[PDB]
Amino acid sequence: THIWYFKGVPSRLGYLLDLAPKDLEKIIYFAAYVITSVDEEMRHNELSTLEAEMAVERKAVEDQRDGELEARAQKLEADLAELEAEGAKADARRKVRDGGEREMRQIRDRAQRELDRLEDIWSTFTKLAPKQLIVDENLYRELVDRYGEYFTGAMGAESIQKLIENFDIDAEAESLRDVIRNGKGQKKLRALKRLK
């Protein structure tokens, strides 16, 4: 990218693309991904089935975690009953109980975190729009391996070229003009500046 048209304030690249200068600095130097295009109709139609698959995954992980925790609780109760049978120290029994409770809380929170990741993936996919960012590379690669055939992501000046060649100048200009028609002053100044 030519240095002048993205650094000198006002950065005309930012005004053209409606992107914050910090965002442009990040995307240019390969620090974040951006979306080039999305097949909105295809994802809109496939939302039902994809929700079904996400729910299947969620119920599978929940069932596995619940069964594993139930088995651990049963073995822990058996251990405590054996401690009662062996007549050991009551405080040592409470130490064993506290350790088992710590293990259970740890494992249940691990499953909670994993389901949080699982739902965050869906949340990110649901509202996908062009000119967004995904800083976390783990999140981006997960989105890739899940729905590569449902979105297009890129990084660097190639993404900028892709965005530019998909630009309908006249439609955006007239949209800005009609926004200028309304008297919303705070938005009117931004509309005028971008129109310029």
Binding site: T1, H2, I3, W4, Y29, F30, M155, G156, A157
Partner: protein, 49 residues
């Protein structure tokens, strides 16, 4: 300074380099060209001895 890095990228593309290093070198090449067109426009300017 520009031509060195352009040739290194040309050499790394056809050797099947991993993604991280080619990304780093592309960033470096972009910074080098930016220094070429206008030095001192960003961060620490390039300076000779």
């Amino acid at each position: 300074r520009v031509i060195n890095r352009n040739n290194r990228l040309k050499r790394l593309i056809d050797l099947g380099a991993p993604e991280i290093i080619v990304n780093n070198e592309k960033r470096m090449l972009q910074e080098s060209v930016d220094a070429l067109f206008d030095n001192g426009r960003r961060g620490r300017p390039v300076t000779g001895p």
